[PDB]
């Protein structure tokens, strides 16, 4: 089976450079052209560049002309994307895709890799602050109580959240992080638990932020 | 360039239904259109090439049709593996994709359970106050959340986040977080979040008074 593995994604500051890679296996690499495609909620799926099998002909999207350089080393089965003077809108997941061989007049791409994440930002690595979302009369319904934790001001993605080291899963909702105007991410995680057990049960939220090597346990008690 | 536009943006269907996704081109692309499928966290997967040709190893329930500027992707007898997002792509001139169409699990209307969480005492010591409004287990996804401080509507100081569809009950959850400084938080009393949803006969206001346990 065709196998495409991207690499090189990292946090990079605006105006700086970054080179991605795409090692291939399961087919003859030198026989196919290759594409780069990036995905982000602001741009959807956006084509970046295509290169011929021999490394000669190259084409680029208009917005990346003059800044991105696609190339390949067929003796290594590797595809490269040299990104220079990166901008905030270059933040995306970058896929490499093999060109297909449906013999016709026009060609496209069939098999994509798993992608690699590029985050263009000047924020410094920071562990999160964990704050309790205590249960009260304003978070309860008939026989239920909502509680959680606020994971605020961290960089970069991601953050993993569990409750009581994973033994508590039912009623848990961990929200996708949002980016704040400060350049730091923030998220919350909530859980619905029975009202009758509020006094006796211990609920602990477990926050892990590997980029900063941060591990926090916070017991969430009523006020 | 050639711009693609899909319709609708989000589709609701059940297992065994026949769904239809439409793709429209800015200029004639003849039949140089491909369809791709993508599941959250995963890469796109080729389904249809040249408008109607089925990629090998793709189930027969997928059919493609169209020519010129308008195209359609049909999934007869929807299966659980098909709940994902579908993109169209023209390859007549370079390669440009549509915005995507998310096929979601259809269920009965469910009104949200609105809860509000005042900022903790630990965060206030840091000179910052975050107020969280929680919309729990509702369907469909469309919901309007507004913030009111002493009945004054807020703008530009809240952020929202929504979960994907739940695997058990096919509901959504949404969190709205209002961020204020400690100085601004202490000079106001009533903090409320107003929720508008199809499952609610009227907007719902969850509020608290600052300083009350």
């Amino acid at each position: 089976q065709v196998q495409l593995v991207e690499s090189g994604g990292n946090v990079v500051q605006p105006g700086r450079s970054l080179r991605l890679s795409c090692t291939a296996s399961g087919f003859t690499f030198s026989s196919y052209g290759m594409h780069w495609v990036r995905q982000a909620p602001d741009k959807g799926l956006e084509w970046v560049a295509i290169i011929w099998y021999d490394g000669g002909n190259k084409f680029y999207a208009d917005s990346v002309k003059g800044r991105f350089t696609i190339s390949r080393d067929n003796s290594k089965d590797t595809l490269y994307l040299q990104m220079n003077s990166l901008r905030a809108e270059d933040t995306a997941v970058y896929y490499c895709a093999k060109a297909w061989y449906k013999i016709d007049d026009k060609y496209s791409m069939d098999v994509w890799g798993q992608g690699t994440t590029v985050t263009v930002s000047s924020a410094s690595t920071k562990g999160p602050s964990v704050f309790p979302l205590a249960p009260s009369s304003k978070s309860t319904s008939g026989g239920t109580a909502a509680l959680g934790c606020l994971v605020k001001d961290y960089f970069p993605e991601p953050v993993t959240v569990s409750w009581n080291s994973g033994a508590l899963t039912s009623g848990v909702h961990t929200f996708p992080a949002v980016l704040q105007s400060s350049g730091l991410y923030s998220l919350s995680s909530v859980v619905t638990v029975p009202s009758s057990s509020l006094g006796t049960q211990t609920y602990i939220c477990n926050v892990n932020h590997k980029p900063s090597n941060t591990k926090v346990d916070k017991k969430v008690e009523p006020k | 360039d050639i711009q693609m536009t899909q319709s609708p943006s989000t589709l609701s269907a059940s297992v065994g239904d026949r769904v239809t996704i439409t793709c429209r081109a800015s200029q004639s692309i003849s039949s140089w259109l491909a369809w791709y499928q993508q599941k959250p966290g995963k890469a796109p997967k080729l389904l249809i090439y040249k408008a109607s040709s089925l990629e090998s190893g793709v189930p027969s329930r997928f059919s493609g049709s169209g020519s010129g500027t308008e195209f359609t992707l049909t999934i007869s007898g929807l299966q659980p593996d098909d709940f994902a997002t579908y993109y169209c792509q023209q390859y007549n001139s370079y390669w440009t994709f549509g915005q995507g169409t998310k096929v979601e699990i259809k269920r009965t209307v469910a009104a949200p359970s609105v809860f509000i969480f005042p900022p903790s005492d630990e965060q206030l010591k840091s000179g910052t106050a975050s107020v969280v409004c929680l919309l729990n287990n509702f369907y469909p996804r469309e919901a309007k959340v507004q913030w009111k401080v002493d009945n004054a509507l807020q703008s530009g100081n809240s952020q929202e986040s929504v979960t994907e569809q739940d695997s058990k009950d096919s509901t959504y959850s949404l969190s709205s977080t209002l961020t204020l400084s400690k100085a601004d938080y202490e000079k106001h009393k009533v903090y409320a979040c107003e929720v508008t949803h199809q499952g609610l006969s009227s907007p719902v206001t969850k509020s608290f008074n600052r300083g009350e346990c």
Binding site: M34, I51, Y101, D105, Y107 | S93
Partner: peptide, 9 residues
Amino acid sequence: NPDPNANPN
């Protein structure tokens, strides 16, 4: 020189 959508293989 060639068409961008032509055969790159």
